[PDB]
């Protein structure tokens, strides 16, 4: 039994409804279970029969299933509904459906930094590019040392997404030595964001 | 006064196993109103398979000792199974007032034989509620020794006159157990097995 | 109310064993199940197998048969999960949670609807080590949108966390600290960024703060302007 979420991320606002999916591969019972996980905390579980849930207060969140096809869905969101759900019947748990809060599109204000000297003493060399508020998450980042294309030796750092302004943050980290660093001159930061219509480029050159 | 000197032991020469094991782990026991009786007959009863399934609740042997039941041999073996509550199982004993001695499984003064019950949450409950599990509480009269009761006529309990509808005074006589693993210890779903010999 | 309380943190070398407890409370644990589910960094939760508290009626996944043991102690009210040489692919977050459903139909109400805090365990051939912090210096070209950007580069430490402050907690506004990645030599590292005014950077010292908890480390690195 292998179980599909079938949106992987969805963006929604504060006091919407929100339908989100789960699929069996064979054919399984009438409901499947529930359950929501904020990031640094234990999953939660919502439900898994609406009839088990009608005591006197009422229900925020609602389910429907058939044999193959299940649907959650959130009557009204809260700052706190903004999590990770999860489907599961017995031992299949779903790849997760990821809530984000959608806002408009921010530029993100790109920064490149230098390696330090201590690090130069210490032996190796970290270059770091910075993007700052930007509101959709996919942005990519390249390397270009020397006007040629690094791959293999950067890795990026993405936070959360914030509770007072909803965007984020990223941190790609280009990783040589201090031979490597002394070799070439040029060092590009290349950022394609769907917010910008041409690639932002801060670069710095070697000593100066 | 003249002593014995040898011992001698004639038992029929037959190896085939009764099928105790069968009994004892059906994958679905029967409800109290309709329980199941299986004879056991020609074959050779071993004891020691009853002994390898879980700690039991109750192994109360009536008029047998429990250490001797490989010595002996019997006439007519009848093994009855069953699912009752947890505070029923005193209830399954001769000489004994209630609902499941009264109306469901009685047994006799004269009762001689084995109750074993055993602990089953694990194999029948349900979360929401196990509802395929009845017992009957109201009958005109009370039972006779191994008597089964499958009658599913509506009760009336007025002077009113009962058509079949169950009314303002008319009652199904099956209620149902409701089987939860957030019930107490005695309220929890028990599988019994009578042997009678 | 229903309440299971986990182990502490776990940092192991490989080929170790460990055993993590579970302990049930607010329940009659002899009339429930524990299982214990996955979770790797960055990933989704997995099932790893279940018992059953009375009899320990142990059923484990395919994925995971021999790999891992699972006991209980019914007088104890407790569960284990038990592994014999430890791997480091077994860095996880692990959750013991109740659950109960029908045992010949797997379709039907096996949920798990209470859940423990969750147990962390790192396996790595890596020992305590404090880390380096080099400051992460604006510029003139740095003025961008009117404000600029400064940091701290917290780089080879194990094992995790490490709490980075601003100003002794004065500069709370602007902060992002990143997540940490893990390196190629079983070694983390991290980026702590402010943004500041522009105008603001003579009048104001910004010293960032790095502690290191199993290293017992504390060390203030202050970013000057370049
Ligand atoms: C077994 O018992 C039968 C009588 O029931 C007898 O005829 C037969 O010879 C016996 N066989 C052996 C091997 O003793």
Redesign the interface.
């Known amino acids: 039994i292998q179980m599909t979420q079938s949106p992987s991320t969805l963006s929604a606002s504060v006091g919407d409804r929100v339908t989100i999916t789960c699929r069996a591969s064979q054919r ?2 009438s409901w499947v ?1 529930w ?1 929501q ?1 904020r990031p640094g905390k ?4 919502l439900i ?2 609406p ?2 849930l009608e005591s006197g207060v009422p229900s925020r969140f609602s389910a429907s299933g058939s044999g193959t096809e299940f649907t959650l869905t959130i009557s009204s969101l809260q700052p706190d509904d903004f999590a990770t759900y ?1 489907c ?9 459906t990821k809530l984000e809060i959608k806002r408009t599109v921010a530029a993100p ?3 490149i ?4 000297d ?2 130069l003493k ?1 032996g190796t060399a ?1 270059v ?1 590019c ?1 993007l ?1 508020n930007f509101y959709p998450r996919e942005a990519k980042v390249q390397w270009k040392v020397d006007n040629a294309l690094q791959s293999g030796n950067s ?5 959360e997404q914030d509770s007072k302004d909803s965007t984020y ?1 990223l ?1 790609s ?1 280009l ?1 040589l030595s201090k031979a490597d660093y002394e070799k070439h001159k040029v060092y590009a930061c290349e950022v394609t964001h769907q917010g910008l219509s041409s690639p932002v480029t ?1 670069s ?1 050159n070697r000593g100066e | 006064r003249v002593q014995p000197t040898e011992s001698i032991v004639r038992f029929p020469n037959i190896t085939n196993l009764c099928p105790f094991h069968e009994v004892f782990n059906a994958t679905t026991f029967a409800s109290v109103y309709a329980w199941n009786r299986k004879r056991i007959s020609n074959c050779v009863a071993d004891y020691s398979v009853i002994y390898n399934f879980a700690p039991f609740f109750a192994f109360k042997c009536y008029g047998v000792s429990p250490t001797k039941l490989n010595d002996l041999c019997f006439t007519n073996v009848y093994a009855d199974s069953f699912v009752i509550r947890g505070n029923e199982v005193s209830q399954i004993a001769p000489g004994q007032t209630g609902n499941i001695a009264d109306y469901n499984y009685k047994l006799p003064d004269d009762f001689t034989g084995c109750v074993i019950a055993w602990n089953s949450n694990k194999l029948d409950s349900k979360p929401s509620g196990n509802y395929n599990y009845l017992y009957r509480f109201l009958r005109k009269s009370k039972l006779k020794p191994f008597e089964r009761d499958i009658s599913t006529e509506i009760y009336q309990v007025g002077n009113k006159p009962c058509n079949g509808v169950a009314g303002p005074n008319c009652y199904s006589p099956l209620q149902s157990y409701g089987f939860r693993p957030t019930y107490g210890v005695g309220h929890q779903p028990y599988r019994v097995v009578v042997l009678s010999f | 109310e229903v309440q299971l309380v986990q182990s502490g943190a776990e940092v192991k070398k490989p080929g170790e064993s460990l055993k993590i407890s579970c302990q049930g409370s607010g329940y009659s644990f002899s009339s429930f199940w524990i299982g214990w589910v996955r979770q790797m960094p960055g990933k989704g939760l997995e099932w790893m197998g279940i018992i059953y508290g009375g009899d320990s009626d142990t059923r484990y996944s395919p994925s995971f048969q021999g790999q891992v043991s699972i006991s209980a102690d019914k007088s104890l009210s407790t569960a284990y999960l038990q592994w014999s040489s430890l791997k480091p692919s077994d860095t996880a977050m692990y959750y013991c949670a109740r659950t109960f459903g029908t045992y010949y139909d797997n379709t039907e109400d096996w949920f798990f609807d209470f859940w423990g805090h969750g147990t962390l365990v790192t396996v790595s051939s890596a020992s305590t080590k404090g880390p380096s912090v080099f400051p992460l210096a604006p510029s003139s070209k740095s003025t961008s949108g009117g404000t600029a950007a400064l940091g701290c580069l917290v780089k080879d430490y194990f094992p995790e966390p490490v709490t980075v402050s601003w100003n002794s907690g004065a500069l709370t506004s602007g902060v992002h600290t990143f997540p940490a990645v893990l390196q190629s030599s079983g070694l983390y590292s991290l980026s702590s960024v402010v943004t500041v005014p522009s105008s603001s950077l003579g009048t104001q010292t910004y010293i960032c703060n790095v502690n290191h908890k199993p290293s017992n480390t504390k060390v203030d690195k202050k970013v000057e302007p370049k």
């Open positions: 399984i019972g279970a359950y996980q234990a999953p939660k579980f898994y029969n009839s088990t999860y599961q019947q017995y031992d299949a748990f779903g790849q997760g204000s790109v920064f930094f230098p390696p330090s201590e690090q210490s970290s770091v910075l700052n890795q990026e750092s993405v936070t943050s941190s980290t990783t801060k710095f």
